[PDB]
Amino acid sequence: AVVKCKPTSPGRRHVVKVVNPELHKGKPFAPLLEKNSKSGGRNNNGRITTRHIGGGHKQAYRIVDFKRNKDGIPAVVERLEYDPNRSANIALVLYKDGERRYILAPKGLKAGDQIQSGVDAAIKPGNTLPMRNIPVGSTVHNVEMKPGKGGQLARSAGTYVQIVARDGAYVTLRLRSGEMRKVEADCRATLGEVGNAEHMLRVLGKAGAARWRGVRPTVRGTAMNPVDHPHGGGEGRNFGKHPVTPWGVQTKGKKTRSNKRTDKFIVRRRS
Amino acid sequence: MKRTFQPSVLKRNRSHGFRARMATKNGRQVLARRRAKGRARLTVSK
Amino acid sequence: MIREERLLKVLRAPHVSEKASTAMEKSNTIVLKVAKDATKAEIKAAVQKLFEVEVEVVNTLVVKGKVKRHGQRIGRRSDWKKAYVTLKEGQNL
RNA sequence: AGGACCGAACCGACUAAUGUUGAAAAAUUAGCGGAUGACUUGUGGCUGGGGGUGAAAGGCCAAUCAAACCGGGAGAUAGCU
RNA sequence: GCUCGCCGGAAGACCAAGGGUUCCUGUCCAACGUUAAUCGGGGCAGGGUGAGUCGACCCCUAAGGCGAGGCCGAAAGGCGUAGUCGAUGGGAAACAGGUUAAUAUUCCUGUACUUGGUGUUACUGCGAAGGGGGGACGGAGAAGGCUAUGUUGGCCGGGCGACGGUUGUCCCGGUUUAAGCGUGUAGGCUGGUUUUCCAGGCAAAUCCGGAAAAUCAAGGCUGAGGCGUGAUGACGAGGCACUACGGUGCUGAAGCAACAAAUGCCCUGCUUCCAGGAAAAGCCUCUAAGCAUCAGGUAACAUCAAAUCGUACCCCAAACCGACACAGGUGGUCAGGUAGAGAAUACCAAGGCGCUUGAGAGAACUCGGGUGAAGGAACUAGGCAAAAUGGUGCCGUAACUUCGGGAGAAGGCACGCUGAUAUGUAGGUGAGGUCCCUCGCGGAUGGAGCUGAAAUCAGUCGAAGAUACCAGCUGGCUGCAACUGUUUAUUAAAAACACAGCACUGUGCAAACACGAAAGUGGACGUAUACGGUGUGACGCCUGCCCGGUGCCGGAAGGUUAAUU
Numbered sequence A: 001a002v003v004k005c006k007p008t009s010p011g012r013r014h015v016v017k018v019v020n021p022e023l024h025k026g027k028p029f030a031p032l033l034e035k036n037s038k039s040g041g042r043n044n045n046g047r048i049t050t051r052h053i054g055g056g057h058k059q060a061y062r063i064v065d066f067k068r069n070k071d072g073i074p075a076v077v078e079r080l081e082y083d084p085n086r087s088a089n090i091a092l093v094l095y096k097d098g099e100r101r102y103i104l105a106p107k108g109l110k111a112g113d114q115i116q117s118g119v120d121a122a123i124k125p126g127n128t129l130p131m132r133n134i135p136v137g138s139t140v141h142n143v144e145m146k147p148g149k150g151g152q153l154a155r156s157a158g159t160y161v162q163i164v165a166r167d168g169a170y171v172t173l174r175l176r177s178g179e180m181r182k183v184e185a186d187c188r189a190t191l192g193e194v195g196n197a198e199h200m201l202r203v204l205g206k207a208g209a210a211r212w213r214g215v216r217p218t219v220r221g222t223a224m225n226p227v228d229h230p231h232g233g234g235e236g237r238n239f240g241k242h243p244v245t246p247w248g249v250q251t252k253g254k255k256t257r258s259n260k261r262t263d264k265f266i267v268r269r270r271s
Numbered sequence B: 001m002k003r004t005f006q007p008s009v010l011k012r013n014r015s016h017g018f019r020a021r022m023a024t025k026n027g028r029q030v031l032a033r034r035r036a037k038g039r040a041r042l043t044v045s046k
Numbered sequence C: 001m002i003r004e005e006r007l008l009k010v011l012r013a014p015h016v017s018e019k020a021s022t023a024m025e026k027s028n029t030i031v032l033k034v035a036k037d038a039t040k041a042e043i044k045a046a047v048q049k050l051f052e053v054e055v056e057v058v059n060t061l062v063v064k065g066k067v068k069r070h071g072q073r074i075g076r077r078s079d080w081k082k083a084y085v086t087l088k089e090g091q092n093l
Numbered sequence D: 001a002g003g004a005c006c007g008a009a010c011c012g013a014c015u016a017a018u019g020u021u022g023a024a025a026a027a028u029u030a031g032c033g034g035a036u037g038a039c040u041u042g043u044g045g046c047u048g049g050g051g052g053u054g055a056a057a058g059g060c061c062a063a064u065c066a067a068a069c070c071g072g073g074a075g076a077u078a079g080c081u
Numbered sequence E: 001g002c003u004c005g006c007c008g009g010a011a012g013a014c015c016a017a018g019g020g021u022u023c024c025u026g027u028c029c030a031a032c033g034u035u036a037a038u039c040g041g042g043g044c045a046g047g048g049u050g051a052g053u054c055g056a057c058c059c060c061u062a063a064g065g066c067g068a069g070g071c072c073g074a075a076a077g078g079c080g081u082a083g084u085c086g087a088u089g090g091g092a093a094a095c096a097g098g099u100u101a102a103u104a105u106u107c108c109u110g111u112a113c114u115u116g117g118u119g120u121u122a123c124u125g126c127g128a129a130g131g132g133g134g135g136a137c138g139g140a141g142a143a144g145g146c147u148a149u150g151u152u153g154g155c156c157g158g159g160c161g162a163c164g165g166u167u168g169u170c171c172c173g174g175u176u177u178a179a180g181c182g183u184g185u186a187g188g189c190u191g192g193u194u195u196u197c198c199a200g201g202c203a204a205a206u207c208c209g210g211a212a213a214a215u216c217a218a219g220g221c222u223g224a225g226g227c228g229u230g231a232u233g234a235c236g237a238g239g240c241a242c243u244a245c246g247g248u249g250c251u252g253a254a255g256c257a258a259c260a261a262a263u264g265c266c267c268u269g270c271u272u273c274c275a276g277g278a279a280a281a282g283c284c285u286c287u288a289a290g291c292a293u294c295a296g297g298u299a300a301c302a303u304c305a306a307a308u309c310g311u312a313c314c315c316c317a318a319a320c321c322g323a324c325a326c327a328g329g330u331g332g333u334c335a336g337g338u339a340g341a342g343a344a345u346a347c348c349a350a351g352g353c354g355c356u357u358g359a360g361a362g363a364a365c366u367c368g369g370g371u372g373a374a375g376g377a378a379c380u381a382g383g384c385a386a387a388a389u390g391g392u393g394c395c396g397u398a399a400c401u402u403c404g405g406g407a408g409a410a411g412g413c414a415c416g417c418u419g420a421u422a423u424g425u426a427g428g429u430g431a432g433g434u435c436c437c438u439c440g441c442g443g444a445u446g447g448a449g450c451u452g453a454a455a456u457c458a459g460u461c462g463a464a465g466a467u468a469c470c471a472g473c474u475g476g477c478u479g480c481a482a483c484u485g486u487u488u489a490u491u492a493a494a495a496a497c498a499c500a501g502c503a504c505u506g507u508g509c510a511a512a513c514a515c516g517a518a519a520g521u522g523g524a525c526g527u528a529u530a531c532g533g534u535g536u537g538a539c540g541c542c543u544g545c546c547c548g549g550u551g552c553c554g555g556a557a558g559g560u561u562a563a564u565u
């Protein structure tokens, strides 16, 4: 539930937060945790290859089951938990043989629900099936691209994919971005949409909130000198140039996709 | 006012010590040059 | 076991000083200059065999040489080891 | 509760006087700003010169920066003094 | 040596870094010390640093480094797997008293503790490179219980006062005691136990996880402090006697209680929030190969071992970084009294200092301060500077507003001391005694003693009672930037940068993009509610017309058009 903060200070006036009473309040499940140290946008050369990354709160990685390959053994949801590593929430499920797993929390799931994966799983939110066994027109998430590889599409909060057609060894998906794409019918998908659809309604409110999430400030190209940006220079505010990246490529409309290997799987572009 | 030299023996040895110079071939060329000049103190090591 | 050669090499000299004298007269401790690489056990065994006393325990420290001056020349004396070794209150070597 | 308020430590540096062969190659004195945060600080580590880093002043990269320092081409060239 | 002055959240004491003999003793005064020097961090010579428990080394890992093979690269090399290193973090153990000119948790006295190896014994399933538990972790906030520590009383020793008084409700001083061991408390957390079964834990498992019965309804873990002991000990004001008047030997009373109380401990707890908060080993537990009247494991006892290196001294400084015995800089710890909210501030305690040129004089002028008749911004670019305000409680407080603010708006009143209320009150603490229960660090009752605000009324002194130090000037109109932040280290702090928010655009994942001849790596162990680029810059009302020029996007009938042939 979204909540508007009260303007008791200038930094709180515009804060809109997402508050979920069902998220677990205790510590996460330790055996499914591991460290993940921060990079600051630096590669193995030590150089900044992606700007504006650094700082933020320490985080532990949660090993989430994207493969959903433990077929035919029902599992029970034990709780919903906060995940700092992604926008969606995750659910701790307990299988009937005693094994516990994290899965992405779909919409409408709560403690006590039963999920199941496999060819013979029922058509219910949270159940994983190969898309050959999912009715045309269904809404799915955590969609595989290669069979057995793991879910890679429609993973962020509130996302989902529509199965528009099924002809032969391939199905046609309408991706969240809006392009039509083909994928092998043996690729698995989870029924329903990702939960936490109110995530996009949050308003950070202040600069420090964005600093908490490891984002460093962005300096405008027009505000610097010509020696370090094509937009730089000028006596007063001057532009007189076609907008470009810090490396001189046009940055308003020029297309950058060049992949003829995968062009065959793209039925229609997002537009 | 804080001046430029802030001594740390461990950092000195790791930056300029005998084993640091021997690590790379350019450091070994540094050692060879200083041997050819006849330097009494080859490195900062001691 | 330590050979006779090592035990014969590990004792250098008796240290003589006012603190050494008071240790002699107050704690039945003798103060010795010993080999730089000499261990506590080697010193104990050497004192027991080459002086024929019973040794309670040996305490050791390393003395640093002083940087001296011999007419504008920068010299440095050598480090050396000193052993405080006490006897079993019945020997008085 | 709070990039909340007043205010020491701590971090900073708005005004004035002094000092300007200084006590000091940037300080002192009286005031001044922040002071649970985009805070501050210790230890260690990583990024290297047309390169790095930069909440961007062409700022900083060992009192050196519109291209560091050391050595070399090198006795560069100098219709100039 | 007697006075005087200064610091005392330091200008005292102690760790780490850094330095390296500057430490102590004797001797000397050339040079060094901004003067003299008999003095010195100066010269010269000698002396001085004692560890199973402190630290390093050691075991373990972070960031990161290196890296057998490997992948890549004209060469040089680059990256990286298995591995191996790398603390600023995890891992066993000691305290008190005494002692040197110079060391001490290291020496001595007393009293403890940890780990390992051997030998004898009683038994006994042991075994890892594997599994599981544990170690193991954020911010803020709140109270309770304590302790360090202080105050006062009691007690012990001493005193009866240079000038009026001083046998008392008088004055000075002391009234200290560890680790360990035993007790398991204020408090926190968790339901135990026994069976049976099971697609999980790379194989196995009696261990973990899961499921179902029965049974008890309590078992366990954690835990400051207190009490006992350690301790009839040590320490102890003082007092006897030498002395080299530097010090010494010896003896030694009281050694209790109440109150107050930490930012330290319980507490790695509890409550709450979102930004969701290391790793590995030590440790416990389970088995695999394997071994089997042996090796091995547990308990007991005895014996042995615990090496090596550091340890002086400075350490907010004359010994470190600043060329200097330089108004600079330098991480952590300790934290007394009175007044005070306080680690502010004033005066002090312990403790440490008077800053390595002095002596006169009492011109101009410069520096840093005090006071000023009448006027009161007339000064000046400008109230620059100075002057002024300044506390607590209570009363009261406008436009505007995003309803939080504006606001400490503005403005005003009281404020010392004495007595009474009330031989000391409201409150806090709390003894004895009385009663009871699974008798204990228990409960209940009970109120002695102790400590103790604030207020009201009456009186009273001064020019003045927030009397010193300390400690907002206030209001009105307007430009700019929403705001907290950031910046030209060393002439610019701003209206500049950033910002939350907005929009455009790219990007389907081996993503775009970026560093890379490459291998790879970041983006991201993220997947379009995501990520990169660009411009704008909270919020409110909004954001009109032009595609001729240039750029970008789409198209391909035609014209022109490379290599090649």
Ligand SMILES: [Mg+2]
Binding pocket: A051, A052, A218
């Ligand atoms: Mg960005």
Ligand SMILES: [Mg+2]
Binding pocket: A218
């Ligand atoms: Mg932005």
Ligand SMILES: [Mg+2]
Binding pocket: A223, A224, A225
């Ligand atoms: Mg500029």
Ligand SMILES: [Mg+2]
Binding pocket: A226, A227, A229, A230
């Ligand atoms: Mg350019």
Ligand SMILES: [Mg+2]
Binding pocket: A235, A236, A237
């Ligand atoms: Mg202009």
Ligand SMILES: [Mg+2]
Binding pocket: A240
């Ligand atoms: Mg123009």
Ligand SMILES: [Mg+2]
Binding pocket: none
């Ligand atoms: Mg040098």
Ligand SMILES: [Mg+2]
Binding pocket: C060, C061
């Ligand atoms: Mg030693």
Ligand SMILES: [Mg+2]
Binding pocket: D004
């Ligand atoms: Mg604030």
Ligand SMILES: [Mg+2]
Binding pocket: D007, D035
């Ligand atoms: Mg303040």
Ligand SMILES: [Mg+2]
Binding pocket: none
């Ligand atoms: Mg600054």
Ligand SMILES: [Mg+2]
Binding pocket: none
């Ligand atoms: Mg100042």
Ligand SMILES: [Mg+2]
Binding pocket: none
């Ligand atoms: Mg403020």
Ligand SMILES: [Mg+2]
Binding pocket: none
């Ligand atoms: Mg400029």
Ligand SMILES: [Mg+2]
Binding pocket: none
């Ligand atoms: Mg510079």
Ligand SMILES: [Mg+2]
Binding pocket: D067
């Ligand atoms: Mg150039």
